[PDB]
């Protein structure tokens, strides 16, 4: 509501009118790292401002506390703050303790104004009503979710704010209950921030092939978790692809020739940059379907490749070096027997960028490599600071990778993605054989204490990858109901478990009467309530509240409260 | 037919003259430079060729033996066009490849790989000596005296038996003078020790290289090779043919002081206790033995060898004697840090030379136990060190 | 016309192989062999050969395991015939393997254009000394310790040739693995001459 979709252009014009001055930079863009779509959105905004030639600054951030301290050091000269993928649900005014009177200037007259402007692009869903309504210094580029779902919430909020006694109770309790009901609901990203920014550019008419590519990448990254959102947005991106597509068709391939064409993007892993056999061997969906984690799954994989009539040796060959006959008839090969093995869902048409003779890349593979670069791009408080510094360095490395010129960095990211994926697969199979997953009847707890790959798992995204693979296998396992999934990873240097609360998910292909319903994630709220109740040291500072830290000894007591918690 | 060969040649010419990345005709420039240094040969990345057009790469893979010569001809034509002004000669250019794809273990190679461009690696065990290969021949007909010639390739011919303007069964003969030839080596490769299966002999295989690929490596050098699995009818089993490999390209697995080095050494000299630092640095695990460290430093440093005007020379190589494994570790460290060294505790195609000690020169020669060492008796060492010496030991260590 | 398995019992030929080489006889033998492969099962009733084919495709192995007793159990007539003339029925049974494998793994020829039948549990056994000219030209199960092994060198599985006189191309004759080809004649011009091998058309098999 605060800034609806229609008024994005107006907000942008206001930002210009305020911070546009070649004399100095008054625009600062706070960005929460560890989010592909956030990075894409930030890059798009950077390019836009570069066109507008408005000096500004980029501020990578990892934790809410980092954001707080960064705001503390802010200078009054800055009047525009862009928050990318963070702060939407929190009461930023409260969290940053912003006093309207401190910033109020030129209020007049039925008008208001302030010295600074906090623009929020954090499109999770459970928007902080105070930010939406209570605050004015807070600016939120809403996707219309408020005006389409929170109208009753708006009414209740404005009534409660209006209330300043049987009738008083008879109204206040209902409004409080309405607001609480809007609360106590798990977070679930609503839409691509990249999509919102692309829409804004369309409003400003800045749309170009590069911007569409960036939006595609952001949405594709979002896909894995919120596949429904990706499905909803896919037609729009295809429409834009057709809109910007050049007239020339089948133009002779030249180095300058660059195309972004839609064609079958088989739901595999690094197909173009890994042997077909490897791509299948590490495609989360593939392993979940065939349970490749068990050796019998590997046997079935060999059986499937034999059914394909593809020489296994060939299947392990480098994809770029496939024989032309197979490299082209793979379409028919997949058309046949994929249903026989139940892997028909793998077939997927998707965006695939390409340029000159250097080669081609699918948006999925590109975002995978971007995540790999983000993750492995390179006194306890100092150790955490250095780790987050490495994460920020990886953030900037990915930023550089976005440029086409730095194809070398993209290749490095591809290799890193391969290595991380294989390590994740090995760890997952070891876990499943170990049966570390414990059915607690409130969640399937799986705590990690083995040395190897533990160092890698200190990165929240690495843990998320492992948990995503585990969740894929579990959801495909019909025996397992959609229980909440808990992951923890002890850090020996800090002696803390990287607790992660991972929501369940219906089978990728699943799209029946159910699956339509979004299974919100209450992990964060449960963790926060337990932490407030208890005193076990933890770190909710991380923007992704579902991920938190805890002492090696504070874990099991915290886990005990967690299973004791009824919030989950 | 010849039209299709010309078409393939034209396609490769277009690839060379057009394949561009960013803003550089990498291959055009590379060819121009290689010509500029007279190195008439081009190296091509397979991935690049595929990117330009998969079809040419696939056709090459199908019939490498014939496709490759056409590609080399295209390279020659491009070189002439870019290096010599038209309407105003060069030799056939060697083509070098780099697939960088999945390898094939030496043992795994079999009939399946015949005539296929193979990509593998190993350690070169031995190197032959270069031989002549007739790229071009000058040919006289024995009776009618009809001149002619042949242009042969090192892939997949014999002197024609027919007169071509009875004259004879083979009236043609070679005129070595006008004919032209190239170099051709022969190398033997063994599978990687790791690649060797459990308790199995390491397999071995032989190759041939030519043109600029000649003399590019030496025995006992780990290397990765690209070539066509080839088979030749050795004069040395029914229907059994000897398998070899034609070396398309080589990559070295293992592959003077600048300003920085001399500056660092000068600063080291600036240090007053530099000598003490050294003594502290030799075999730190061997605590104590300070005099031993000092003597090690001295021996490593040698001495100012001088040759008098009368000719008699002043030796510069110092020789130190030591007296369990503590000394063994010391000598091991010495050889490790020694620029050149020979460590041996006394245990120690028609050509014979002197013993192991003879081969040692410069650097150092270490022996854990002379009291144990008696091979060739002491007198050999007596002479080799006192005198630094058909049977003369022209060594200095 | 094709013949019955009982009709096959009547060899009615100069030699066992002479009977086998009979066209209709070959058809009957192939049909019976395929019937055995698809039908013969363990006491469990599972097609042991069906599972063997499954694994063969899965492992991409080019050799199919076969148990002699199994055929002796059913279609033993073919067991005796093979014992008398192993080569011919080996070829026929290899084609039967072609057909049995492809139905379960269509287009497996890509993985292996051919397959090799591997008989097992051959009842009769002889030592090297036991061997006799009577044994020659027939299958034998023998044991020992390998004395010396040679490296696996390629051998020309199939061979075309080229008469030096005219010799554009000569038939892709199958090399026997024991002797040379020595066509000693040319079809293009009826005479002898240097028959240069046609490198264009030739199949190579690992030899040892
Ligand atoms: Zn003549
Ligand atoms: Zn003839």
From Swiss-Prot, chain A:
GO terms for cellular component: CMG complex; DNA replication preinitiation complex; nuclear replication fork; nucleus. The lineage of its organism: Eukaryota, Fungi, Dikarya, Ascomycota, Saccharomycotina. Its main location: nucleus. It comes from Saccharomyces cerevisiae (strain ATCC 204508 / S288c). The gene is CDC45. It comes from the Eukaryota. GO terms for molecular function: chromatin binding; DNA replication origin binding; single-stranded DNA binding. This is Cell division control protein 45. Keywords: Cell cycle, DNA replication, Nucleus, Phosphoprotein. It is found in: Nucleus. The keyword Nucleus applies.
Curated annotation (Swiss-Prot), chain B:
It is found in: Nucleus. Present with 10300 molecules/cell in log phase SD medium. Early fractionation of eukaryotic MCM proteins yielded a variety of dimeric, trimeric and tetrameric complexes with unclear biological significance. The MCM2-7 hexamer is the proposed physiological active complex. GO terms for cellular component: chromosome, telomeric region; CMG complex; cytoplasm; DNA replication preinitiation complex; MCM complex; nuclear pre-replicative complex; nuclear replication fork; nucleoplasm. ATP binds at residues 324-328. It catalyses: ATP + H2O = ADP + phosphate + H(+). Belongs to the MCM family. Component of the MCM2-7 complex. The complex forms a toroidal hexameric ring with the proposed subunit order MCM2-MCM6-MCM4-MCM7-MCM3-MCM5; loaded onto DNA, forms a head-head double hexamer. Interacts with CSM1. Changing residue 327 to A: Loss of MCM2-7 complex helicase activity. This is Minichromosome maintenance protein 5. Keywords: ATP-binding, Cell cycle, DNA replication, DNA-binding, Helicase, Hydrolase, Nucleotide-binding, Nucleus. GO terms for molecular function: ATP binding; ATP hydrolysis activity; chromatin binding; DNA replication origin binding; helicase activity. The chain holds residues 20 to 517 of 775 of the full protein. Acts as a component of the MCM2-7 complex (MCM complex) which is the putative replicative helicase essential for 'once per cell cycle' DNA replication initiation and elongation in eukaryotic cells. The active ATPase sites in the MCM2-7 ring are formed through the interaction surfaces of two neighboring subunits such that a critical structure of a conserved arginine finger motif is provided in trans relative to the ATP-binding site of the Walker A box of the adjacent subunit. One of its GO terms (biological process) is pre-replicative complex assembly involved in nuclear cell cycle DNA replication. Its EC number is 3.6.4.12.
């Amino acid at each position: 509501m605060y800034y609806g979709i229609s008024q994005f252009s107006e907000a942008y014009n206001k930002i210009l009118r305020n911070s546009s001055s070649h004399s100095s930079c008054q625009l600062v863009i706070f960005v929460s790292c560890l989010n592909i779509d956030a990075l894409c959105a930030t890059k798009m905004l950077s390019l836009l401002f570069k066109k507008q030639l408005v000096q500004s600054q980029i501020v990578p951030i990892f934790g809410y506390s980092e954001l707080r301290r960064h705001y503390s050091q802010l200078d009054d000269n800055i009047n525009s703050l862009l928050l990318v993928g963070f702060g939407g649900v929190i009461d930023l005014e409260a969290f940053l303790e912003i006093d309207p009177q401190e910033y109020v200037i030129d209020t007049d007259s039925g008008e208001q104004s302030f010295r600074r402007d906090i623009y929020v692009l954090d499109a999770h869903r459970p928007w902080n009503l105070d930010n939406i309504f209570g605050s004015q210094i807070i600016q939120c580029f809403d996707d219309g979710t408020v005006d389409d779902t929170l109208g009753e919430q708006k009414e209740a909020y404005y009534k409660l704010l209006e209330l300043d006694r049987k009738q008083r109770k008879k109204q206040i309790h209902e409004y409080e209950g309405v607001l609480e009901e809007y609360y106590s609901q798990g977070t679930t990203v609503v839409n691509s921030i990249s999509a919102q920014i692309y829409s804004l550019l369309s409003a400003i008419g800045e749309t170009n092939l590069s911007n569409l590519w960036l939006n595609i990448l952001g949405t594709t990254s979002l896909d894995i978790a919120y596949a429904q959102v990706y499905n909803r947005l896919y037609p729009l991106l295809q429409d834009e692809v057709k809109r910007l597509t050049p007239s020339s068709r089948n133009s002779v391939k030249t180095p300058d020739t660059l195309t972004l064409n839609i064609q079958p993007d088989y739901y595999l892993f690094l197909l173009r940059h890994s042997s077909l056999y490897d791509s299948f061997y590490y495609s989360n969906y593939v392993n979940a379907k065939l349970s490749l984690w068990n050796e019998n799954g590997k046997k079935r994989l060999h059986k499937m490749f034999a059914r394909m009539g593809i020489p296994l040796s060939t299947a392990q060959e480098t994809w770029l070096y496939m024989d032309h006959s197979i490299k082209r008839e793979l379409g028919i090969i997949f058309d046949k027997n994929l249903d026989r093995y139940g892997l028909q869902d793998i077939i997927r048409d998707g965006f695939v960028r390409t340029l000159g003779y250097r080669g081609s890349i699918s948006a999925s593979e590109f975002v995978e490599a971007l995540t790999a670069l983000l993750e492995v791009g390179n006194n306890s408080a100092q150790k955490l600071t250095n780790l987050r510094k490495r994460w920020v360095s990886n953030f900037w490395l990915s930023w550089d990778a976005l440029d086409d010129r730095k194809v070398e960095l993209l290749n490095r990211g591809i290799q890193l993605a391969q290595d991380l994926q294989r390590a994740i697969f090995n760890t997952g199979v070891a876990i499943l054989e170990k049966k570390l997953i414990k059915h607690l009847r409130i969640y399937r707890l799986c705590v990690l204490q083995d040395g190897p790959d533990l160092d890698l798992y200190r990165n929240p995204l690495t843990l998320l990858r492992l948990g995503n693979w585990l969740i894929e296998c579990c959801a495909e396992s019909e025996d397992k109901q959609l229980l909440p999934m808990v992951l923890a990873s002890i850090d020996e240097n800090t002696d803390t478990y990287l607790v992660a609360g991972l929501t369940p998910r219906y089978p990728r292909g699943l799209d029946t009467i159910h699956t339509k319903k979004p299974i919100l994630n209450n992990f964060s709220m449960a963790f926060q309530q337990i932490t407030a109740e208890t005193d076990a040291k933890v770190r909710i500072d991380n923007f992704e509240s579902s991920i938190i830290e805890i002492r090696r000894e504070d874990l099991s007591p915290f886990l005990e409260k967690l299973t004791l918690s009824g919030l989950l | 037919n010849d039209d299709d060969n010309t078409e393939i040649i034209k396609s490769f010419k277009n690839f060379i003259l057009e394949f561009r990345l960013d803003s550089q005709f990498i291959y055009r420039d590379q060819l121009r430079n290689n010509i500029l240094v007279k190195n008439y040969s081009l190296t091509v990345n397979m991935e690049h060729l595929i990117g330009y057009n998969e079809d040419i790469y696939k056709k090459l893979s199908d019939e490498p033996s014939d496709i490759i010569p056409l590609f080399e001809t295209a390279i020659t034509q491009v070189a002439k066009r870019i290096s010599i002004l038209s309407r105003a000669s060069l030799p056939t250019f060697q083509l070098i490849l780099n697939s960088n794809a999945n390898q094939i273990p030496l043992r795994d190679l079999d009939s399946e790989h015949v005539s296929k461009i193979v990509r593998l690696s190993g350690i070169i065990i031995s190197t032959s000596v270069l031989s002549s290969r007739a790229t071009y021949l000058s040919i006289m007909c024995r009776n009618c005296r009809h001149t002619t010639s042949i242009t042969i390739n090192n892939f997949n011919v014999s002197l024609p038996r027919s007169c071509l303007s009875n004259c004879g069964p083979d009236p043609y003969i070679i005129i070595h003078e006008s004919s032209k030839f190239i170099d051709q080596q022969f190398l033997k490769l063994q599978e990687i020790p790791e690649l060797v299966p459990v308790g199995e002999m390491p397999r071995n295989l032989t190759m041939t290289c030519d043109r600029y690929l000649t003399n590019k490596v030496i025995p006992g050098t780990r290397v990765t090779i690209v070539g066509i699995y080839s088979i030749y009818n050795s004069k040395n089993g029914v229907a059994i043919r000897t398998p070899y490999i034609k070396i398309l390209g080589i990559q070295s697995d293992v592959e003077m002081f600048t300003e920085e080095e001399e500056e660092e050494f000068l600063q080291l000299s600036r240090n007053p206790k530099l000598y003490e630092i050294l003594t502290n640095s030799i075999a730190p695990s061997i605590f104590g033995n300070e005099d031993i460290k000092k003597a090690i430093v001295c021996l490593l440093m040698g001495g100012s060898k001088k040759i008098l005007p009368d000719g008699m020379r002043l030796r510069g190589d110092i020789n130190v004697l030591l007296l369990g494994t503590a000394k063994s570790q010391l000598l091991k460290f010495v050889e490790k840090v020694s620029p050149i060294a020979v460590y041996t505790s006394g245990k120690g195609e028609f050509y014979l030379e002197g013993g192991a000690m003879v081969l040692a020169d410069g650097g150092v020669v270490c022996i854990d136990e002379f009291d144990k060492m008696r091979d060739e008796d002491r007198v050999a060492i007596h002479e080799a060190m006192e005198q630094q010496t058909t049977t003369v030991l022209n060594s200095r260590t | 016309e094709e013949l019955t398995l009982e009709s096959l019992s009547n060899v009615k030929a100069n030699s066992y192989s002479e009977w086998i080489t009979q066209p209709n006889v070959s058809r009957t033998i192939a049909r019976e062999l395929k019937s055995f492969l698809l039908e013969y099962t363990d006491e469990t009733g599972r097609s042991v050969y069906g599972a063997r084919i499954r694994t063969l495709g899965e492992m991409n192995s080019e050799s199919l395991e076969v148990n002699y007793r199994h055929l002796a159990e059913s279609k033993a007539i073919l067991a005796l015939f093979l014992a008398k003339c192993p080569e011919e029925m080996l070829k026929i049974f290899d084609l039967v393997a072609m057909e049995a494998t492809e139905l379960h793994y269509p287009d497996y020829a890509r993985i292996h254009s051919e397959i090799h039948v591997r008989i097992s549990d051959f009842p009769t056994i002889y030592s090297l000394r036991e061997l006799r000219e009577s044994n020659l030209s027939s299958l034998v199960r023998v044991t020992g310790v390998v004395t010396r092994r040679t490296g696996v060198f390629p051998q020309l599985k199939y061979v075309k040739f080229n008469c030096l006189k005219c010799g554009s191309i000569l038939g892709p004759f199958f090399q026997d693995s024991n002797e040379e080809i020595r066509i000693s004649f040319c079809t293009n011009c009826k005479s002898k001459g240097p028959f240069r091998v046609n490198g264009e058309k030739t199949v190579y098999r690992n030899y040892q």
